[PDB]
Amino acid sequence: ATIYFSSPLMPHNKKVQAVAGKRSTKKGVAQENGVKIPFECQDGNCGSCLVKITHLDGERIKGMLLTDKERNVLKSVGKLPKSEEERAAVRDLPPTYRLACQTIVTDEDLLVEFTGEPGGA
Amino acid sequence: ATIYFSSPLMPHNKKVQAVAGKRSTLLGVAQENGVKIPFECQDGNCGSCLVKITHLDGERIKGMLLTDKERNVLKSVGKLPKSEEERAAVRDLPPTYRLACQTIVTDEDLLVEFTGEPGGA
Amino acid sequence: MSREEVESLIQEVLEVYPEKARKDRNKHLAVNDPAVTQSKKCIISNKKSQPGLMTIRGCAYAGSKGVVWGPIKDMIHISHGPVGCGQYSRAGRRNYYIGTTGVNAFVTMNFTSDFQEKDIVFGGDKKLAKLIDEVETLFPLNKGISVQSECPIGLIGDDIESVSKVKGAELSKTIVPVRCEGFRGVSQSLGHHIANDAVRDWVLGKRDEDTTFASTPYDVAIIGDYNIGGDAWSSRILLEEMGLRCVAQWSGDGSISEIELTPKVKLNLVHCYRSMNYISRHMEEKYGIPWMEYNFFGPTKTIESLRAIAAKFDESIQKKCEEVIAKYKPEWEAVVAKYRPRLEGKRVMLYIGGLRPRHVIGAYEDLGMEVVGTGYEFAHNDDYDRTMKEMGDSTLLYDDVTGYEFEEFVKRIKPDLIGSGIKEKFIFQKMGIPFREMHSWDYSGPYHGFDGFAIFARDMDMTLNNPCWKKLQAPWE
Amino acid sequence: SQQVDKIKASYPLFLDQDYKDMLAKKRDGFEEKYPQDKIDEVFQWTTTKEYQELNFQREALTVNPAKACQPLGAVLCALGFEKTMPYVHGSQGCVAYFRSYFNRHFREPVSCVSDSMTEDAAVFGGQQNMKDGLQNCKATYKPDMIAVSTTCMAEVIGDDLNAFINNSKKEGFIPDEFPVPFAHTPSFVGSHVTGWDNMFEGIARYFTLKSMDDKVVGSNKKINIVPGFETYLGNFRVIKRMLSEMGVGYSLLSDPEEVLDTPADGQFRMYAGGTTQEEMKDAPNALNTVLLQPWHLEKTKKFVEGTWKHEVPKLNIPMGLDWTDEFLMKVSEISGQPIPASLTKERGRLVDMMTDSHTWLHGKRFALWGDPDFVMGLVKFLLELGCEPVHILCHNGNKRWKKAVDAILAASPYGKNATVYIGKDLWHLRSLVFTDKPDFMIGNSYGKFIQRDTLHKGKEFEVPLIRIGFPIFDRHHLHRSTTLGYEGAMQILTTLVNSILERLDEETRGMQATDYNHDLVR
Amino acid sequence: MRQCAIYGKGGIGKSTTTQNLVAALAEMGKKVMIVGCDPKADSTRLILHSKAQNTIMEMAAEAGTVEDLELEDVLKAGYGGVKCVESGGPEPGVGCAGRGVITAINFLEEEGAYEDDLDFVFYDVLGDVVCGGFAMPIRENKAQEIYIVCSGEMMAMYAANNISKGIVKYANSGSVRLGGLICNSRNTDREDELIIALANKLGTQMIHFVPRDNVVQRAEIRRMTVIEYDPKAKQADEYRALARKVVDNKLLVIPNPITMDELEELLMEFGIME
Amino acid sequence: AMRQCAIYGKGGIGKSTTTQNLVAALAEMGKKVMIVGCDPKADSTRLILHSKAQNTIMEMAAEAGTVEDLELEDVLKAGYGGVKCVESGGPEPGVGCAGRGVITAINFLEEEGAYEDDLDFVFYDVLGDVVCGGFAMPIRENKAQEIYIVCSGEMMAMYAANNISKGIVKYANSGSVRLGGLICNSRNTDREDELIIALANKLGTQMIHFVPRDNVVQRAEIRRMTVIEYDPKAKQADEYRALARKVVDNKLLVIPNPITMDELEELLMEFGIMEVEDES
Ligand SMILES: Nc1ncnc2c1ncn2[C@@H]1O[C@H](COP(=O)(O)OP(=O)(O)O)[C@@H](O)[C@H]1O
Ligand SMILES: Nc1ncnc2c1ncn2[C@@H]1O[C@H](COP(=O)(O)OP(=O)(O)O)[C@@H](O)[C@H]1O
Ligand code: ICS
Ligand code: CLF
Ligand code: SF4
Ligand code: FES
Ligand code: FES
Ligand SMILES: [Fe+3]
Ligand SMILES: [Mg+2]
Ligand SMILES: [Mg+2]
């Protein structure tokens, strides 16, 4: 899995190679490579680790489970539209915005964008 | 070279492999792969092939030459800030917005975004 | 003096051109004002040359193969394409190296693909792989291969990157593809940039996961010194006498292992900003290695640079620096005492592509000479930012000067000496004006350090005060 | 450390003890150099015969070639016409390299321009470059004619010169009557001599194709001379002198000897002498046309035979005794002028020198490389001197040339040892001179390294180089030498015999060891 | 240094109304300049008297590029006070048609043609669609005041609604505001009070109501403004009245867009549409 | 040696006036210190540069292309003996995070290398009203080693002090951020000196010098200068110096003990600020 991190705080986009499916989440991949996504909780209830995910290989999109905990947090920061909530419930396809501490790396190429601010602006 | 094409007109982002430095430009790679960037001239003056290019591997950004014809068209479309013009003139670093018919593929990973509209909104 | 005279001279020189050429060339000629900090409003640089005006610029292939990659001695450099490009650049630049040519060093050799018509029509990738195989059996002691591409390589659409990857994986060899086609870029500067990018992307990050190298708090790396006539060796002896350890040399007398050992080094000493600022910035951003620009042209600049370098270490290095300065003081004092009275007051015009016009101004001023004209074929606006302070008021500044422009400027100004390349030497010698080659040092040198300052003073006195310059006119005429 | 009274340049300053210690420390610490014994073993391996079979086997890698590309010859040909600017359509690096090359060989200014084609022209072609460059050059340097060549970039692009120049004239960039001859000179075909041939044919066709109606062969009672790619001014001078002493009207077409040798008198002359446009226009009126270097003038021969209706004689290069005799005989037959007594006396003097130097020359082994006509003339002269050319190399020779040279070597007992190599470079020649040691090499400055290599094996394996050909960079003013004619033959003879004598003097100079043969009289 | 823009559907006399307006302002000691943003370059012919002013886009392509273009070659003062620039546009189907306006407006700032002697700057901008370089005055805050030239016909009122919608979008970003409505009359009934009804519902004001005349037809052949031809004409005084209210207009409002039915209901009551 | 400090508190209590006066005292003892204004309104460098509201990094990065193109000298000015001054600024109200400027400015200072070796103190003045966002970033990313909370006798300022101590203890394990003390700025209210002493004892920290109010502060502010320079011989000048000596001599950096809202109410009635409260 190839992950491209992107942020206005980062002078250059960083490209990393990651192992898919690890129990350590995208939060794990970011922390080994020194990517400063704000992580301000250990229970997954804040919105601080909100990131925007783009699947660069649009054909190789993997079905996943949107956990009820992540779904409610994404709604608490106004980052889960109703159409994307229905797509996850019916088609099991990931939404545009994810929580990095709750996102499992899949075997594809991803672009991860964050602003350095917690979810909810 | 890996190129990721992205557009709201495209249901899925398309990933292609391209040979770097070909006489055929980004317009060649797009046309061979069925990516519908609007091409409306053969002299490189219309500006309809405007695309937004993101270097995903920020460490692997290659120095290039911004020709006077592409530069002037980008000003006429308005997609050339004064800082990017100075960056290209002094550091030979590509601007964010490019003309696909005049863009030479380099040995890196690129994200190419277009709206299906000609340059100049 | 005579700033208005200089402006009028520029105006009357520009009259021969058509409207487009005149309008563009007006932006590239200036009268120096040392109070200016931003050159770009005053003068323009790094633009395309006007067609059919006899520019002195080269191509990106010259800036990459001939400048950056060529001096590396234990690597084999392949001129991919037709034969001319490799033939004309063979051993034309004096980058000094220690080795046995053809066995473990290959600097003065010409390896080429020698493209024919069928290569152009069908491609040269299979030929490239076969050539790589042939090189390894013929030269088993080479420590790496670089493929410098010429114009048809990019013009016909060959994939040298994939060939390099496959062959390097197969043979466990470092194969660096350089897309330095001559039509890319307006001058050699983009060749410098492309070569630096190739170094960064295929060479620099190889000894990243190893730590077997035993480092030292006094570790430095010389960056952008190509050992022209032995300059880098004089600079190295001056640095080592100061108490530092020089790990790398880019790229005169340079080795691939020295390039790979540059991440370990504590400090980067960059002699040429134009050709190797890119890799210095990359190393600073990645490995945290600071870098600084120094000048070893003439005693004043040499002492200033030595003190500035010593200021970056502890007090023992400063004491050793004072020791070195005290040791070398009488030598250059004697050199000045011998040669300054012969050279005092003479006026010199310069035209070298980047850094060096500004770099040698101090050495000339150390002998009582003054630089009326300074000029660059390929420098960017930052180089002009750096050179405006070092040039006197109301002096001429030129960028990408044409042959006609330079001839007219020299005719009006009438300097006592001109320093430029081989393509102007015989033009200005037939005009009765002494000329020194400022690229190759006229097959002399080195000019760096005090040892080089002695030779520089001797050479300037030799050429300027030569009897043949009074024999130019026939007695009956 | 320097002494102000005796200042030392790089040699021998870097032989000082401190510099030696510095270099040793650098090599030991950071270079990771191979063991010296390993380097010596690999060098000795490169000397041997199994290495020569590997070196001969290669079909792709070229190491140290002995040829240049076509636009160099095109520029040299264009320089031989009066008030003409060579113009190369393509990238500027080509022109910079051409000018540097010719500046280093001739030590003279070389004027040439490009249209500086870049990525813009790489994508959209270079027509605007052509228009702007033609107008700019005509306005700035004021030539009477502009001769257009092409680089490899233009040929791959497929930019065509005729349409570009016609559009330049039609759109008012240059006057419609301004002469702009052109030629296509791809660097991936042939070599520099091919470019010379292409440029000459382009100019001749430009000036003598649309008016053949009023041309009568022999009406001006002159003979056209086409020298070809020539880098010796003495050759132009000797051809002119030999034809002038014979009372023969002649027209030297594309002679650059004036612009390549201009006086230093306080002013710079961009143009000097050259073939006039009137001489080119009147060329088909000549009795005949002779080609001094036939083996790289083939398209020119086709044009002259099929358009000017000239019966071009089958002559070799006027090198040596026999071929100079044949050239003078053909000129006498064509022009109806007898050979004067001065030429007979000069030939007798050459024969006198040959008989005087014959004892040293007899049986010397020579390895030589160069352009086809020059190489074959040199081989012929070596055969006439009793010398043995054992290694004959021509990187830009074809199979017909090889057949002709083999036929030449067959008609003499001194060519039994001789073998002919085509398409081989100077690494092949290094292998040849290692495994089959000759007495001397004859070639350009690039052979100086081969000598170096031989000296590394030992003094008894050293093969000295003799500098005849192009380019010569490490010696001064050798471009004023004459290779053609009796004068050229005697200059070559003097060089050869004195090189042999100098080598013998160096070998027999050791006191009480070899100086019993250090003879005053030789 | 007030800069205004004339926006409206093509064929509603906007180019002539801007030129007669400009001619009306030149006499009263005011130096103004007209910038023609309409693709067809007929917006300065009555001032310059020229057959067809060479556009910036036209002469930039022939001279290589816009850098090789001189201001004295693009800016002609056919009338001494009045300055006329024609932006021009690309050929149909070749890129965005409004990109000629971006090049010309940027070129004029670069050369400083807005310096020290301009009282009014007028932009005659295509109003059929507001996008690309045509929306550039409103988007870039180039024209603070906007006047819409409309008509009794439904498409003109629809065009006026669209421009107001675009002004609202850029109200926060820029000072640009609707300055008023200009009603150009075709010989139909119940027009002036119809557009007054439109303005009253937009929160803006009517400025004037220029009626159709035959004096303008005589001026067309002359390639001259009515003011310079016949300053005693009833239309020529009408244009002075419209000009004088433009200078002395003070209220500039953020418009209120009008829906499809509400615009439609205005047409049905007046009988313009059944 | 690179002693990084931060000053927190409610908006409008006097953080900027206390910080600039403290910093002016430190330079008087020959200490090279730097002020980084992390307050959105960006007025924490008025009395050091004397000019005006200092140009912020947000404004300079916006007028230029981006942050890396912006110059270090352009935003980091020298005043009052060269004490370096920088202002983070903030984004447009209602757009993004109001603390985004703090995240941007600290990253720019680190990348350039403005944290040079010969600096003794670095002070951050940050609005403490909300802890979250870029205002918590100095605590979260270990930017500030010690924190001093300006507090008054008001209920809000006391509540804000408890909120900031809650932030410190959350990030105490991951970094060296600790509580240095509390500064009591006087509104001249009765029985506030002991109230802030009591709160500091409840929190488990000391109390830094208490600052009585006076109109000499406004006198130096209308001329745009620190009180210590405007009068060096005033008692407030020595009082600001006394606060600075205790800051340098401070060594009790503790992990606070945040108290419950009802405890704040109970401790307010015992000093007469809050009237005793009965549910019925
Ligand atoms: N005030 C007016 N009175 C009478 N006729 C007018 C008036 N204004 C414009 N016209 C006519 O309306 C037509 C539209 O003119 P023009 O401005 O060129 O079109 P557009 O509004 O599309 O630019 C012109 O032919 C002109 O004769
Ligand atoms: N020590 C003091 N004595 C008297 N007034 C003060 C003192 N410190 C600050 N002030 C006043 O309090 C007001 C607000 O203080 P300020 O420093 O702006 O608060 P903030 O902490 O929000 O920056 C200022 O107008 C100032 O005059
Ligand atoms: S590399 Fe460059 S043209 Fe920096 S291409 Fe050129 S041996 Fe010059 S002014 Mo020849 S940027 Fe070196 C140069 Fe300077 S070859 Fe030498 S002298 S200091
Ligand atoms: S700009 Fe540079 S030096 Fe020029 S070709 Fe291009 S890479 Fe090379 Fe070599 S072969 Fe001859 S000289 Fe050229 S025309 Fe074809
Ligand atoms: S994190 Fe705090 S400062 Fe940022 S937007 Fe949310 S409430 Fe505002
Ligand atoms: S760190 Fe709190 S939800 Fe991820
Ligand atoms: S297709 Fe017209 S500018 Fe690229
Ligand atoms: Fe000469
Ligand atoms: Mg109109
Ligand atoms: Mg404040």
Nearest beta carbon to residue E93 from set B40, B69, B78: B40
Closest CA to D2 of C240, C342, C450, C235: C450
**Alpha carbon distance C38, C24 (integer Å):** 20
Going by the DSSP 8-state scheme, the letter that residue D16 receives in this structure is S
- Is residue F5 within 8 A of residue F146, CB to CB? The reply is yes
- Is residue F179 within 8 A of residue F203, CB to CB? The reply is yes
- In the chain, the amino acid numbered A110 is L
Question: C-alpha distances in angstroms, E10 versus C454, E159, E199?
Answer: 80, 10, 20
Cis peptide before C341 (omega within 30 of 0): no
* Range list of β-strands (E), C194-352: 219-225, 245-251, 267-270, 291-293, 347-350
**Alpha carbon distance E212, E224 (integer Å):** 17
C60-202 and C203-317: identical CATH topology: yes
Count CA atoms closer than 13 A to D295's CA, side-chain side. Answer: 23
**Alpha carbon distance A66, A89 (integer Å):** 8
Structural domains in chain D, CATH included, are 69-214 (3.40.50.1980), 215-319 (3.40.50.1980), 320-363+484-522 (1.20.89.10), 364-469 (3.40.50.1980)
| Residue of the CA atom closest to atom 12 of ligand 1 | E13
Per the listing, tokens 């009790």 go with F252
- Taking the alpha carbons at both ends of chain F, their separation in whole angstroms is 57
Question: C-alpha distances in angstroms, F42 versus C356, F85, F97?
Answer: 46, 11, 16
Label each residue of E214-241 as H, E or C: CHHHHHHHHCCCHHHHCCCCHHHHHHHH
Query: Which letter, b or e, does each residue of F200-210 get, where b requires 16 or more Cβ atoms within 10 Å of its Cβ?
Result: bebbebbbbbb
Q: In the structure, how many helices (H) and strands (E) does chain B have? A: 3, 5
Residues contacting D341, CB < 8 A, separation 6+? none
Question: Which of helix, strand or coil describes residue F73?
Answer: helix
- Is residue C179 within 8 A of residue B21, CB to CB? The reply is yes
Label each residue of F19-83 as H, E or C: HHHHHHHHHHCCCCEEEEECCCCCCCCHHHHCCCCCCCHHHHHHHCCCCCCCCHHHHCEEECCCE
**Alpha carbon distance E158, D257 (integer Å):** 81
**Alpha carbon distance E94, D106 (integer Å):** 54
Catalytic residue at C246?
Answer: no
Question: Which of helix, strand or coil describes residue D119?
Answer: helix
- Is residue C237 within 8 A of residue D18, CB to CB? The reply is yes
Q: Which structure tokens are listed for D64?
A: 């140290």
In angstroms, this model's resolution equals: 2.3
Q: Which positions 144-163 of F are in contact with A (Cβ < 8 Å)?
A: none
Contacts of A38 in chain F (CB under 8 A): 137, 140
Closest CA to A100 of A32, A34, A29: A29
**Alpha carbon distance E25, C140 (integer Å):** 87
Catalytic residue at E83?
Answer: no
- In the chain, the amino acid numbered E160 is A
Q: Which structure tokens are listed for C64?
A: 């990459």
**Alpha carbon distance B81, C351 (integer Å):** 33
- In the chain, the amino acid numbered D144 is D
Q: Which structure tokens are listed for F8?
A: 């927190």
Question: Which of helix, strand or coil describes residue F201?
Answer: helix
Q: Which structure tokens are listed for F119?
A: 């600096």
Per the listing, tokens 């051409």 go with D98
**Alpha carbon distance B65, B88 (integer Å):** 8
Closest CA to F154 of F257, F276, F274, F258: F274
Question: Rounded to the nearest 5°, which phi and psi values hold at C419?
Answer: -115, 115
Class of residue E118 by CB neighbours under 10 A (exposed 0-12, middle 13-18, buried 19+): middle
Q: Which structure tokens are listed for D504?
A: 């013998």
- H/E element holding D422? strand D419-422
Question: Rounded to the nearest 5°, which phi and psi values hold at C135?
Answer: -65, -45
Contacts of A6 in chain B (CB under 8 A): 54, 56
Q: State how far residue F90 is from chain A, nearest Cα, in angstroms.
A: 13
**Alpha carbon distance D393, D419 (integer Å):** 9
**Alpha carbon distance C4, B121 (integer Å):** 49
Q: How many CB atoms lie within 10 A of CB D282?
A: 18
- Residue ranges in C366-446 assigned as alpha helix (H): 381-388, 403-413, 422-429
- Is residue D395 within 8 A of residue D423, CB to CB? The reply is yes
**Alpha carbon distance A70, A56 (integer Å):** 23
- Is residue D9 within 8 A of residue C459, CB to CB? The reply is no
Chains within contact range of chain D (3+ C-beta pairs < 8 Å): B, C
Per the listing, tokens 């001769």 go with D147
Question: C-alpha distances in angstroms, F21 versus F120, F208, F225, F234?
Answer: 17, 15, 9, 13
Q: Helices D36-47 and D49-57 meet at what angle, rounded to 10? A: 70
- Is residue C152 within 8 A of residue C82, CB to CB? The reply is yes
Q: Which structure tokens are listed for D353?
A: 């020198």
Closest CA to C399 of C151, C112, C64, C40: C40
D42–C103: do the CB atoms touch at under 8 Å? yes
- In the chain, the amino acid numbered F80 is Y
Cis peptide before D445 (omega within 30 of 0): no
Helix, strand, coil proportions of chain F in percent (round to 5)? 40, 15, 45
- Residue ranges in E150-233 assigned as alpha helix (H): 154-169, 192-202, 215-222, 226-229
- Residue ranges in D385-513 assigned as alpha helix (H): 399-410, 426-435, 448-457, 485-507
Residues contacting F274, CB < 8 A, separation 6+? F155, F265, F268
- Is residue F126 within 8 A of residue F7, CB to CB? The reply is yes
Closest CA to D384 of D307, D489, D311: D489
Is B114 a known ligand-binding residue? Answer: no
Going by the DSSP 8-state scheme, the letter that residue C200 receives in this structure is I
Q: How many CB atoms lie within 10 A of CB F244?
A: 24
Q: Does residue F103 sit at the A interface (CB-CB below 8 Å)?
A: yes
Q: Which CATH code of 2.40.50.180, 3.40.50.150, 3.90.1150.10, 3.40.50.1980 fits the domain covering C203-317?
A: 3.40.50.1980
- Is residue A110 within 8 A of residue A53, CB to CB? The reply is yes
**Alpha carbon distance A72, A85 (integer Å):** 10
CA of F136 to the centre of ligand 5 (A): 10
- Residue ranges in A5-105 assigned as alpha helix (H): 26-32, 68-76, 82-91
Q: Which of B2, B9, B13 to mutate to test the interface with A (most CBs of A within 10 A)?
A: B13
CA of D113 to the centre of ligand 4 (A): 14
Per the listing, tokens 């690229």 go with C439
**Alpha carbon distance C114, F248 (integer Å):** 74
- In the chain, the amino acid numbered E109 is E
Question: Which of helix, strand or coil describes residue C462?
Answer: helix
Nearest beta carbon to residue A15 from set B11, B12, B56: B56
**Alpha carbon distance D437, D364 (integer Å):** 11
- Is residue E263 within 8 A of residue E195, CB to CB? The reply is no
DSSP string, E58-119: HHHHHTSSGGG--HHHH-B-SSSS-EEEE---PPTTSS-TTHHHHHHHHHHHHHT-S-SS-S
- Is residue F20 within 8 A of residue F47, CB to CB? The reply is yes
- Is residue D111 within 8 A of residue D86, CB to CB? The reply is yes
**Alpha carbon distance C422, C94 (integer Å):** 13
- Residue ranges in D436-484 assigned as alpha helix (H): 448-457
Closest CA to D398 of D295, D291, D301, D471: D295
Catalytic residue at E14?
Answer: yes
Going by the DSSP 8-state scheme, the letter that residue D219 receives in this structure is S
Is B101 a known ligand-binding residue? Answer: yes
Q: How many CB atoms lie within 10 A of CB D407?
A: 10
Please give the residue of chain B at the shortest CA–CA distance from C152: B23
Question: Rounded to the nearest 5°, which phi and psi values hold at F177?
Answer: -65, 125
The residues facing E177 across adjacent strands are: E145
Question: Rounded to the nearest 5°, which phi and psi values hold at E123?
Answer: -115, 120
**Alpha carbon distance D101, D231 (integer Å):** 12
- Is residue D295 within 8 A of residue D372, CB to CB? The reply is yes
Dmax of chain A from CA atoms?
Answer: 39
Cis peptide before D471 (omega within 30 of 0): yes
Ligand closest to E11 (CA) is 1
Q: Which structure tokens are listed for D38?
A: 């390993």
The residues facing F185 across adjacent strands are: F211
Closest CA to E125 of E97, E101, E157, E154: E101
How would you classify the pairing of strands F77-79 and F83-87?
antiparallel
Helix, strand, coil proportions of chain C in percent (round to 5)? 45, 15, 40
Question: Rounded to the nearest 5°, which phi and psi values hold at C376?
Answer: -125, 135
Q: State how far residue B14 is from chain C, nearest Cα, in angstroms.
A: 22
**Alpha carbon distance E55, D453 (integer Å):** 71
Q: How many CB atoms lie within 10 A of CB D442?
A: 26
**Alpha carbon distance E224, E219 (integer Å):** 5
- Taking the alpha carbons at both ends of chain C, their separation in whole angstroms is 34
- H/E element holding F263? helix F261-269
| Residue of the CA atom closest to atom 4 of ligand 5 | F97
Per the listing, tokens 């696909």 go with B100
- In the chain, the amino acid numbered B90 is V
The residues facing F181 across adjacent strands are: F148
Residues contacting F21, CB < 8 A, separation 6+? F47, F226, F227, F228, F240
**Alpha carbon distance C428, C406 (integer Å):** 10
Class of residue D191 by CB neighbours under 10 A (exposed 0-12, middle 13-18, buried 19+): buried
Class of residue E256 by CB neighbours under 10 A (exposed 0-12, middle 13-18, buried 19+): middle
- Nearest atom (ligand 2) to Cα of F215: 4
The CA angle D193-D197-D201, to the nearest 5 degrees, is 170
Contacts of B45 in chain E (CB under 8 A): 61, 95
Which position among F31, F32, F120, F129 bears the catalytic label?
F129
Q: Where are the domains of chain C?
A: 1-59+342-476, 60-202, 203-317
**Alpha carbon distance C421, C404 (integer Å):** 16
Question: C-alpha distances in angstroms, F252 versus F206, F208, F244?
Answer: 7, 11, 15
- Is residue C335 within 8 A of residue C457, CB to CB? The reply is yes
Question: Which of helix, strand or coil describes residue D1?
Answer: coil
Residues contacting E107, CB < 8 A, separation 6+? E56, E66, E69, E74
**Alpha carbon distance D345, A110 (integer Å):** 90
Q: From the CB of B48, is ligand 7 less than 6 Å away?
A: yes
The CA angle F107-F108-F111, to the nearest 5 degrees, is 85
Count CA atoms closer than 13 A to B29's CA, side-chain side. Answer: 26
Question: Which of helix, strand or coil describes residue C41?
Answer: helix
CA C428 to chain CA mean position, Å: 23
**Alpha carbon distance F104, F113 (integer Å):** 14
Contacts of F100 in chain A (CB under 8 A): 115-117
Count CA atoms closer than 13 A to D210's CA, side-chain side. Answer: 3
- In the chain, the amino acid numbered C275 is S
Closest CA to C434 of C412, C414, C417: C417
**Alpha carbon distance E117, E104 (integer Å):** 20
Closest CA to F13 of F133, F148, F166: F148
Class of residue F232 by CB neighbours under 10 A (exposed 0-12, middle 13-18, buried 19+): exposed
How would you classify the pairing of strands F208-211 and F178-185?
parallel
Per CATH, is C1-59+342-476 categorized as 3.30.460.10? no
- Is residue D73 within 8 A of residue D201, CB to CB? The reply is no
B63–C278: do the CB atoms touch at under 8 Å? yes
Q: From the CB of E14, is ligand 1 less than 6 Å away?
A: yes
Q: Which structure tokens are listed for C425?
A: 């030497």
CATH code assigned to C60-202: 3.40.50.1980
**Alpha carbon distance D326, D317 (integer Å):** 10
- H/E element holding D146? strand D145-150
Residues contacting D47, CB < 8 A, separation 6+? D434, D435, D457
Per the listing, tokens 């996102």 go with A103
Residues contacting E20, CB < 8 A, separation 6+? E46, E225, E226, E227, E235, E236, E239
CA of C54 to the centre of ligand 4 (A): 16
Q: Which structure tokens are listed for E197?
A: 């009804």
**Alpha carbon distance C220, C245 (integer Å):** 6
**Alpha carbon distance F212, F184 (integer Å):** 8
